[PDB]
């Protein structure tokens, strides 16, 4: 099973999926290995190769810190890379239906991981199911994360910032030149991702270099206007200079700072990333997107406000409990091993950790806005409020606020609210419907009748997978089945959204309006 | 002849014809020695005896006060101006008795408001002839000293100890205990009621050990001591006294010389300077009012309330829907009683600086945030309505609710109302809605008089409010009838049930303006 790309032939492998067949091509190189003189630089286009590339196993994951807070725990370890770490990691994967399609829609997955972690080869990103059930072509790339991906000495081509974003954009460029040879339609390409993946997709709506490289966009639990997504030039420069200091690379001029950084072992870079931001949070993104004047021609909120971005259709959404995952990474009183019932004071300590630079009036005003209890007897009040504080501020409110502005320029927007907690979720019950745990439903893992999961979870995933594909193909996440539930456009006034769960999905309006009003209209003044 | 022998002497009254019946009115009975000369600023002194028969057939002098003159000829403002001669010789009370004479009637004692600076018992809206006719209760009202003459304070000093006006109220209560039986009254069934500063006063008699045996129960209309305007700290009070002395050229070595000089000033000279003892006042500013004097009030009232140190009895408490609107035409930019007063966001913010002079920019910004979650925009009247609600909630509604809640935690029955009817004869514009003080005419039964141009529906409402007040006074339960009547449940800190009062339908609701009051009790203080 061989395909001639513009750079050479690639051998693939036949997968047997659900009685049918899917053809997979794992680890196709799409850029030159960013090594030596090439570390910190934008990805260089690839040159032809003589023999045949065996695209039969996942490639190296990009250099990154590993989450080892809970050794042996499936809930944390499932996000860690499952192939070797290496700077030689610029590769992508293509999944294709059998029999081979003629002009198939392409879905391109961009993984999350706070711009510091992530890899395309995770089991929860296996695109074979989508290829089988909806007969789309699925692509996913590895892009550089952390300092190696986002170190910025702004204005300097030797370390310009947003290198990982250019990686993704180069992978998109690859699809355009090569996907017809796989039976895909370059003219029908939908970007989707989650967390930093979603913020990445949203930045691709803004970058002129990405304008001609895709068609529609799906944003799961993330957008560029989230408070963690984009770092200012001053902060990015400070962080870079802190890293130079931490690694013994503090130099007189920038060209020498970089020479020295190019000579550090990857691990001396990785293990120093944690120290560059003086009072980080469990949500702190050490090295991420910045305004480089290249990929991002200007500050994002301004571009969006002014109206210069790709005019197309989007599908945006969030999980019910986006904030709970981060509480066990340093909020006092919390633990994945107990119920984590906290007190008013532990809650105030929590705010301190999640809101380090904020005045006492500001924190006090957050406490006030999230303490108007329905039942004042309820002992889990503070635990839930802190989770909501962190979810609304970091994910939910940015996502709604993005969708309002985007739709205000006459674009079809569809908003979802994912409310189902997987019966397999390794994290304890109080954590609810966690950040990241809708992904396996999108990628159709519960369609596998040997995979554990409930029947209802198979049906739920069946329709999500159907709407995602139909949104990709058609620009409307419509479902079949004369029952269905009819998904309506998102508008600044009514703000209609669809809920997703196993016991009846319904159309609601103004998601968390009372909470979000605080974050968009008051908090920026404290 | 109509003649009652009292401890102080015989008193002659007059018959009034009310609703085809008769009420006997004794207007302007002295209950204390005239606080003149050396008695100025002192506590009231007991009345010995008057000579011959005192003719209580006309209302007495009202106490010295400044007059509202912002609107000449306008009934809306002028109905609160005193309607008898002004004088320092003003310590008199009024008694209305049903005819024929009761043997043991329940007594209602009215205490007027006017921000401790103004007011008089002789206003038409406090005529007690109706309540006496219809419910056969005895009605008493008294004049008490207001302003500097009433509340000049140098605590510890008997020449001007503070709270003299409150002690005037108290002495009148004492007079009722001593004398009401001769009028056919029951001194063991006495209910205090008042509005605004009158209600703050009533709430203060609940705290004052000297008042504890001079009444039975208490009704509080739009006011309580815990409202931001009600009580001055001990040294803010002294400060005001010292400043008044400076303004009038009475600043001296010692305190008794200061008072000595102030006793030689014309009342007008003192009265015209009251408004300058405070550097930055609001339309709701109480220049001279109640304070912690050590005699009447042994500690800050909030502390006494928290500690359960008050008279354990039943209370009836309530507020009007638009408490704050009245104050806006007296200072806030954009507002006018002859305009519909559509204001902008910037006008709103300027209004906030008027009503909250000393509050930080962030304090004001958060009041703004809390009051602008609009149901509908642009809807021009949003900001106008918002500012009225801010003023009303902060000064009247939220403290009244907080007071009832805290009072009921100590085990006595409390009943809360929300008065929502706008009088068909209200002279103020529509935008001011259900105003401060405009439930009073309904409580006193004025709409029962058919020759008066109220609607039938207003008569029915008033007849019902008159019955419930009178029932509360008599029984500690503001019932109307058993059968065909909406029951008024107790106010408990959990459910916080209250009764709405209007002409459409009266009903039981819960947690009045809980979301707004939550801001004023639990966030604003920290600001
Ligand atoms: C409103 O509710 C109260 C109960 O809280 C009722 O109080 C009761 O009132 C009756 C008179 O209607 C009292 O009984 C009688 O009083 C008269 C003097 O008025 C006397 O002649 C009789 O010998 C007898 O004592 C009764 O003490 C009192 N009960 C209690 C425990 O308060 C009131 O009747 C209700 N009113 C209406 C119209 O619903
Ligand atoms: C820009 O950098 C400085 C220095 O940051 C230091 O922070 C340490 C945690 C460590 O990473 C080290 O390598 C790095 O150089 C930041 O200023 C510091 O702020 C703290 C108070 O939080 C002070 O105690 C320090 O005096 C001060 N820096 C020093 C070392 O003088 C600064 O905050 C940062 N700017 C931004 C954007 O936050
Ligand atoms: C779905 O579950 C089955 C077994 O059911 C669970 O039993 C629990 C006590 C615990 O072992 C849990 O891990 C397990 O999921 C899984 O089958 C077993 O998987 C284990 C490895 O975890 C193998 O060692 C066993 O040989 C295997 N067989 C059994 C016991 O039936 C199965 O892997 C799982 N499926 C997925 C994809 O999650
Ligand atoms: C209170 O008023 C009376 C006069 O007014 C009343 O006189 C009653 C006898 C009775 O008829 C009643 O209806 C009427 O309103 C003053 O009367 C004094 O005594 C006689 C009786 O009229 C008069 O001729 C006197 O002029 C008058 N005395 C004086 C001082 O001249 C009574 O004095 C008065 N009391 C007070 C304290 O002023
Ligand atoms: C008590 O109050 C005085 C206020 O001074 C007042 O003087 C009055 C005669 C009157 O004119 C009034 O308008 C004026 O405000 C406080 O005095 C402050 O500080 C000095 C005097 O020490 C004055 O020069 C200031 O003007 C005054 N403040 C302001 C802004 O007016 C005094 O501090 C205060 N003391 C206490 C214990 O409350
Ligand atoms: C009994 O009287 C009612 C009115 O009495 C009402 O009083 C309120 C304070 C409250 O207690 C409420 O529960 C109670 O119903 C009479 O109803 C009235 O009838 C007239 C016509 O005759 C209507 O025009 C009024 O709107 C209406 N008043 C209301 C509902 O507020 C009614 O006559 C009588 N009902 C019965 C069943 O006998
Ligand atoms: C930025 O800095 C590098 C290195 O910094 C050098 O600065 C010199 C003035 C001196 O202090 C030296 O010790 C220090 O290392 C510059 O490279 C230098 O270039 C000069 C000639 O211009 C050589 O003589 C030095 O040997 C050389 N240093 C090394 C090790 O390369 C570089 O020129 C400068 N570039 C920019 C953009 O300013
Ligand atoms: C004042 O009112 C009283 C009470 O209504 C009147 O006295 C009553 O008069 C009627 C008829 O003359 C008698 O039947 C009653 O018995 C009287 N009551 C008493 C206690 O005497 C009296 O007429 C009025 N006085 C006036 C008009 O000055
Ligand atoms: C008026 O009613 C009161 C009760 O409200 C009677 O006064 C006394 O009531 C106390 C309890 O508060 C009892 O201990 C006494 O027995 C009552 N006094 C007497 C002498 O019986 C009072 O009697 C009534 N006054 C009347 C009818 O003139
Ligand atoms: C696997 O590969 C063959 C070619 O070697 C391809 O034609 C076919 O689609 C695949 N076979 C199946 C059905 O798995
Ligand atoms: C490619 O795959 C085939 C089949 O497994 C294998 O025989 C061959 O060695 C591989 N080629 C390379 C590049 O090693
Ligand atoms: C749960 O575990 C954490 C971490 O060990 C601990 O600090 C906390 O006190 C525990 N919570 C409860 C309910 O005891
Ligand atoms: C895909 O088919 C051809 C390229 O094979 C292209 O001309 C056409 O416009 C595309 N459109 C679709 C969605 O069929
Ligand atoms: C949904 O898919 C596309 C939307 O444009 C269209 O071809 C199809 O008719 C639609 N079906 C339903 C049931 O909405
Ligand atoms: C009416 O109120 C006063 C009239 O003197 C004025 O200052 C205000 O601007 C007017 N309001 C409006 C614009 O209706
Ligand atoms: Cl960040
Ligand atoms: Cl430098
Ligand atoms: Cl730049
Ligand atoms: Cl099925
Ligand atoms: Cl009648
Ligand atoms: Cl209007
Ligand atoms: Cl009742």
CSV table of C-alpha atoms in Angstrom, one decimal, chain A residues 9 84 88 92 128 161 226 275 342 344 385 395 397 422 426 442:
chain,number,residue,atom,x,y,z
A,9,UNK,CA,6.8,7.3,-1.8
A,84,UNK,CA,10.4,8.1,22.4
A,88,UNK,CA,13.6,14.8,15.6
A,92,UNK,CA,2.4,13.4,10.7
A,128,UNK,CA,-8.8,5.0,12.5
A,161,UNK,CA,8.5,32.8,18.7
A,226,UNK,CA,-8.3,32.4,27.2
A,275,UNK,CA,11.3,28.2,36.8
A,342,UNK,CA,-12.4,22.2,51.7
A,344,UNK,CA,-13.6,28.9,53.2
A,385,UNK,CA,-17.0,26.8,43.5
A,395,UNK,CA,-12.0,27.9,29.5
A,397,UNK,CA,-16.0,32.3,29.5
A,422,UNK,CA,-17.2,8.6,31.1
A,426,UNK,CA,-9.9,7.0,36.3
A,442,UNK,CA,-15.1,12.6,19.4
